[PDB]
């Protein structure tokens, strides 16, 4: 009486990531951010760092806005 | 003895949900007591203050049980907080 | 019988326990430990 009801709530818990909270979208989207995957982000981020080279390039109203 | 604090606990707490202390320009009307929180409902202190304050503000212009590990409650707050809102703010529209 | 009407009632409140996530062959021991935990988190969502 104990094993029918733990597959019944495990399998349960997974879906429940899926199909309401979009745990496949956040992998899927992570990606087109951290590792660069999308192109025109790390060729304009990159490229809009690199144009600049100390005190400046380093304060919240720069690095916090490109 | 579960039995019984719990048909005492049902009905000494049918006054209090029945009708937070006030007072007599707007945030010293009604104020929360900090000491007087159920600590098991300190995680909607705020909606409750918020819920019958909006309540007021248009009535003078013109169930719940409680279960252990179930929130059957905390559940049944929300759906009237969230209406309290859409008759001021619609008021006020 | 009278051993059984024990545990019987010896166990009552344990149930109750286990009534809220929803020696012996550790085939299952671990698997209790994760199969409450996974209600008490959806008890908070």
Same mark, same amino acid.
């Given at each position: 009486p104990l094993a029918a009801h733990i597959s019944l709530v495990n399998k349960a818990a997974v879906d429940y990531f899926f199909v309401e909270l979009h745990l496949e979208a956040h992998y899927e989207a992570l990606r087109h951010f951290l590792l660069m995957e999308d192109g025109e982000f790390a060729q304009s981020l990159s490229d809009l760092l690199f144009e600049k080279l100390p005190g400046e390039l380093l304060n919240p109203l720069v690095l916090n806005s490109v | 003895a579960q039995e019984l604090?719990?048909? %005492?606990?049902?009905?000494?707490?049918?006054?209090?949900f029945e009708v937070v202390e006030e007072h007599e320009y707007w945030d010293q009307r009604y104020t929360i007591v900090q000491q007087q929180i159920p600590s098991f409902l300190q995680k909607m202190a705020?909606?409750?203050?918020?819920?019958?304050?909006?309540?007021?503000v248009v009535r003078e212009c013109g169930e719940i049980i409680y279960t252990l590990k179930e929130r059957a409650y905390v559940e049944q707050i929300e759906?009237?907080?969230?209406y309290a809102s859409k008759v001021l703010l619609d008021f006020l529209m | 019988?009278?051993? %059984?009407? %024990?545990?019987?009632?010896?166990?009552?409140?344990?149930?109750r326990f286990i009534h809220?996530?929803?020696?012996?062959?550790? /085939?299952?021991? /671990?698997?209790?430990?994760?199969?409450?935990?996974?209600?008490?988190?959806?008890?908070?969502?």
């Open positions: - | 604090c719990l048909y %005492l606990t049902k009905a000494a707490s049918a006054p209090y705020d909606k409750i203050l918020s819920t019958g304050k909006y309540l007021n759906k009237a907080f969230n | 019988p009278v051993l %059984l009407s %024990l545990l019987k009632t010896s166990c009552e409140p344990y149930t809220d996530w929803v020696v012996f062959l550790k /085939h299952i021991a /671990h698997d209790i430990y994760v199969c409450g935990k996974t209600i008490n988190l959806l008890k908070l969502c």
